[PDB]
Amino acid sequence: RSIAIDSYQEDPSVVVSNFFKGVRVPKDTEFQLYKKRKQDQFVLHGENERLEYDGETDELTTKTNQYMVGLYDKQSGKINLYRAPVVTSKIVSK
Amino acid sequence: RSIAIDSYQEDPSVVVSNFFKGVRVPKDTEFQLYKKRKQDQFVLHGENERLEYDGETDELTTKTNQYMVGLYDKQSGKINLYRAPVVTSKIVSK
Amino acid sequence: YQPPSDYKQCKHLKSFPVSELKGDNKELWLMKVPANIDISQLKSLPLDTDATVSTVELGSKNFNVLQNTSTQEGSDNTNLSLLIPSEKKKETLKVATSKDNKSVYFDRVFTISETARIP
Amino acid sequence: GYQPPSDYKQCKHLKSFPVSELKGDNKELWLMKVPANIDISQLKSLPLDTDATVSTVELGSKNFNVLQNTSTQEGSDNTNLSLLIPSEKKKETLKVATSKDNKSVYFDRVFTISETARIP
């Protein structure tokens, strides 16, 4: 045999709580889960036929600030916000 | 005078790349985005009219290990994986 | 109640098949694995479900495997409660229970660890 | 071929951004730099004055300074900033956003939201 991975869920679903041996939690008990705001770090790679493009986010900036790309409507006065990484990149020949 | 937020996207969608002033990137250039593997930190809170439930993840275990809850099928030899935080909790009378 | 200043509630909790648990055919597992293994890239886990101690190939690296539930230390896991999101509002969690109304327990617990090295 | 650092994973399943709305008359493309501690999802409005160069907004219980960076000589030129968007041709790939005229897409405004001076 070999155990087949049918599905893998990376985003929060279940929680394993650790109390004490023989714990009894009433069936009616309702719980909430809270996640610490921890912003992602990225690497960007690009390839042309002639050139190579390579960049990364700044570790400290990732801790201090967030960047949003916005699509603003002059007429309606409405904005659509999108959180985005800002990667500083280099171009190198092949 | 206040801009209305029609939508906010927290997950990755677009990338802001920073090269140099006057950069020309051919439209055919293909890029890939890569994210640093993190483990999140959590807080768990529960309640009812008799007790209060409070727990958190261990900072070091978050850095060293990942936990999975799995549903295994003896017959098919297939597993369904779910990433999970392990929270050590306390019960306090209300 | 107010959570820590830098914690935000998880309000979009993904589904977990509660129903698949009461049936004789499915086993509920817990796996402790090194954080450096990218599970998403794996297609199979060649864990030997009969062995207490084994070895497993992942990527191109050497990992020891220990079926904790096969030792006297890992036989009792009644201290561990599985909280699942309710089908009503996947914004709140409740303890997973059976027809016996006593908390759901892990059938198997596995630990995957790196082999000793001298960095 | 290319290989990313050992602890970096590829971004698959990139979310939607309306590319088509880009060179639409009534639309502008903005970049905002904001403090990481502000929860944007809890906000219903951003009281930015698109007419001001400098101002003090009030989000939640705090006060912040606002700078329309594109209204300065320093931020006059932002041609170093390119927007990369998803592709319908190569799976999980990004390409530079271009206009109908094959011109590189540039930000119309850039804002920095910063906290007011405090001794923590």
DSSP C11-50: --PPP--GGGGTSTTEEEEEEEEETTS-GGG-SEE---SS
Looking up tokens 């930015």, which residue turns up? D48
Closest Cα of chain A to B80: distance in Å? Answer: 5
| Fold (CATH) for D1-120 | Double Stranded RNA Binding Domain (6.20.250)
Alpha-carbon radius of gyration of chain A = 23
Residue B47 phi/psi, 5-degree rounding, is: -165, 170
- Partners of chain B (3+ Cβ pairs below 8 A): A, C, D
Contact D39 C6 (CB under 8 A): no
- Which residue type does C94 have? K
> Between C10, C43, C79, which is nearest A21 by CB?
C79
In chain B, beta strands by DSSP E: 3-9, 15-18, 30-36, 42-47, 51-56, 65-73, 78-84, 86-93
3-state secondary structure of B85: coil
- Which residue type does A89 have? S
Contact C82 A14 (CB under 8 A): yes
- The token pair at D105 is 């897409």
DSSP string, D14-37: PPP--GGGTT-TTEEEEEEEEETT
Helices (H) and strands (E) in chain A, counts: 1, 8
Closest Cα of chain A to D93: distance in Å? Answer: 9
Contact B77 A6 (CB under 8 A): no
> B74 in the Ramachandran plot: left (φ > 0), alpha (ψ -120 to 50) or beta?
alpha
Residue of B91, B92, B70, B93 lying closest to B82 (CA atoms): B70
Contacts of D80 (CB under 8 A, 6+ apart): B18, B19, B20, B21, B22, B23
Interface test with B, best of C15, C22, C32, C56 (most B CBs within 10 A): C32
CA of residue D53 relative to chain centroid, distance: 17
Contact A17 B43 (CB under 8 A): no
Instruction: Please tell me if residue C79 touches chain B, with a CB cutoff of 8 Å.
Output: no
CA distance between the termini of chain D: 49
Task: For residues D78 and C93, give the distance between their C-alpha atoms in angstroms, rounded to a whole number.
Answer: 47
CA of residue C40 relative to chain centroid, distance: 15
Contact D46 B1 (CB under 8 A): no
Determination technique for this entry: X-ray
Pairing of strands A42-47, C108-114: unpaired
- The token pair at D17 is 């951004």
CB atoms within 10 A of CB B90: 11
Instruction: Please tell me if residue D39 touches chain C, with a CB cutoff of 8 Å.
Output: yes
> A22 in the Ramachandran plot: left (φ > 0), alpha (ψ -120 to 50) or beta?
left
| Fold (CATH) for C1-119 | Double Stranded RNA Binding Domain (6.20.250)
Task: For residues C90 and C19, give the distance between their C-alpha atoms in angstroms, rounded to a whole number.
Answer: 16
Alpha-carbon torsion D72, D73, D79, D81, what sign? negative
Residue D105 near residue D119, CB atoms below 8 Å: no
Domain that holds residue B78: 1-94
Contacts of C69 (CB under 8 A, 6+ apart): C75, C77, C106, C107, C108, C109
Task: For residues D108 and D98, give the distance between their C-alpha atoms in angstroms, rounded to a whole number.
Answer: 15
> Between A17, A23, A34, which is nearest C83 by CB?
A17
Resolution value, angstrom units: 2.5
Task: For residues D111 and D117, give the distance between their C-alpha atoms in angstroms, rounded to a whole number.
Answer: 18
Residue B2 near residue D73, CB atoms below 8 Å: no
- For D86, the enclosing helix (H) or strand (E) is strand D81-86
Closest Cα of chain D to B62: distance in Å? Answer: 15
- Partners of chain C (3+ Cβ pairs below 8 A): A, B, D
Q: ∠ CA B31-B36-B38 to the nearest 5 degrees?
A: 150
Pairing of strands B78-84, A3-9: parallel
Please count the CA atoms within 13 angstroms of the CA of B79 that sit on its side-chain side.
Answer: 27
Residue D106 phi/psi, 5-degree rounding, is: -115, 150
Instruction: Please tell me if residue C95 touches chain A, with a CB cutoff of 8 Å.
Output: yes
Closest Cα of chain A to B47: distance in Å? Answer: 6
- For A30, the enclosing helix (H) or strand (E) is strand A30-36
Contact D17 B13 (CB under 8 A): yes
* Total domains in the fold of chain B: 1
Contact C40 D7 (CB under 8 A): no
Residue B73 near residue C26, CB atoms below 8 Å: yes
- Which residue type does C110 have? F
> Between D4, D18, D37, which is nearest A45 by CB?
D4
Task: For residues C44 and B58, give the distance between their C-alpha atoms in angstroms, rounded to a whole number.
Answer: 29
Task: For residues C78 and B22, give the distance between their C-alpha atoms in angstroms, rounded to a whole number.
Answer: 64
CB atoms within 10 A of CB C33: 19
- Which residue type does D97 have? A
Closest Cα of chain A to D112: distance in Å? Answer: 9
Residue of C76, C34, C29 lying closest to C49 (CA atoms): C29
- The token pair at B80 is 């369904």
> Between chain B and chain D, how many beta carbons pairs sit less than 8 Å apart?
112
> Between C45, C91, C101, which is nearest A3 by CB?
C45
Contact B68 C83 (CB under 8 A): no
Contact D9 C36 (CB under 8 A): no
Task: For residues B4 and D50, give the distance between their C-alpha atoms in angstroms, rounded to a whole number.
Answer: 13
